[PDB]
């Protein structure tokens, strides 16, 4: 099945012009844990932001332009993206906005990290209706010596 994974600040802000103003090693640790050994689909801007391929996962880039790196798979359509995943039990889509909006309709699960940060954003997570999703796990944490803001992990499944 297809799942979406994202970190949302207040108002569902997911990206800004520059790097997000927070330092959340535990959030990254949760992202890794939930994506390891799975194929991940991302857009080009997100790829460019990451820098290198995500270790231990099959990296698939969805983009209309030509591929720039031989260490990943470049695809041109959603259909192409899915097919390239092969036969695995769960596909993870990691953004950005556009990619999230194109994949939401086929998604059965959301892994979200709500961060308590108020920022002006450039892109946002698509609007989802809470009456359509069931919260099956939630866990709140305050900022600490290593995390700059408080955050809450949440997993939702489509009703």
For residue 73, state whether it binds ligand DZF (rule: CB under 6 A): no
Closest to ligand DZF by CB, 53 vs 67, is 53
Exposed / middle / buried, residue 20 (Cβ in 10 Å: 0-12, 13-18, 19+): middle
Determine, following the binding rule CB under 5 A, whether residue 121 of this chain makes contact with Cl ion.
no
Which residues touch 153 (CB under 8 Å, ≥6 apart)? 30, 111, 112, 113, 137, 138, 139, 141
Q: Tell me the C-alpha to C-alpha distance, in Å, between residue 141 and each of 6, 21, 22.
A: 17, 18, 15
- In the complex with its own copies, the residue whose CB is nearer, 21 or 56, is 21
> What is the smallest separation between the CB atom of 40 and its own copies, expressed in angstroms?
17
Q: Is 39 or 96 the residue whose CB approaches Cl ion more closely? A: 96
Q: Is 5 in the site for ligand DZF (CB under 6 A)?
A: yes
Q: Using alpha carbons only, what angle is made at residue 125 by residues 87 and 101, rounded to the nearest 5 degrees? A: 50
Instruction: Kindly tell me which of 98 and 149 has the beta carbon lying closer to its own copies.
Output: 149
The CA distance from 47 to 128, in Å, is 25
27 binds ligand DZF (CB under 6 A): yes
Which tokens in the block code for residue 86? 């092969």
In angstroms, what is the minimal distance from the CB of 151 to Ca ion?
19
- Minimum distance, C-beta of residue 136 to its own copies, in the bound complex (Å): 29
Q: Are strands 133-141 and 91-93 parallel, antiparallel or unpaired?
A: unpaired
Binding site residues, ligand DZF, CB under 6 A = 5-7, 27-32, 46, 49-50, 54-55, 94-95, 113
Binding site residues, Cl ion, CB under 5 A = 43, 45-46, 96
């Amino acid at each position: 099945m297809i799942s979406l994974i994202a970190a949302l600040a207040v108002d569902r802000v997911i990206g800004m012009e520059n790097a997000m103003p927070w330092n959340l090693p535990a959030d990254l640790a949760w992202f890794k844990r939930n994506t390891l050994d799975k194929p991940v689909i991302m857009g080009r801007h997100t790829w460019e932001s990451i820098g290198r391929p995500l270790p231990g996962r099959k990296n698939i880039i969805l983009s209309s332009q030509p591929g720039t790196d031989d260490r990943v798979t470049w695809v041109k359509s959603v259909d192409e993206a899915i097919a390239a995943c092969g036969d695995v039990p769960e596909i993870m889509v990691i953004g950005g906005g556009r990619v999230y909006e194109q994949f939401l309709p086929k998604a059965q699960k959301l892994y979200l990290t709500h961060i308590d940060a108020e920022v002006e954003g450039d892109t946002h997570f698509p609007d989802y209706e809470p009456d359509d999703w069931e919260s099956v796990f939630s866990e709140f944490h305050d900022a600490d010596a290593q995390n700059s803001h408080s955050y809450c992990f949440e997993i939702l499944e489509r009703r």
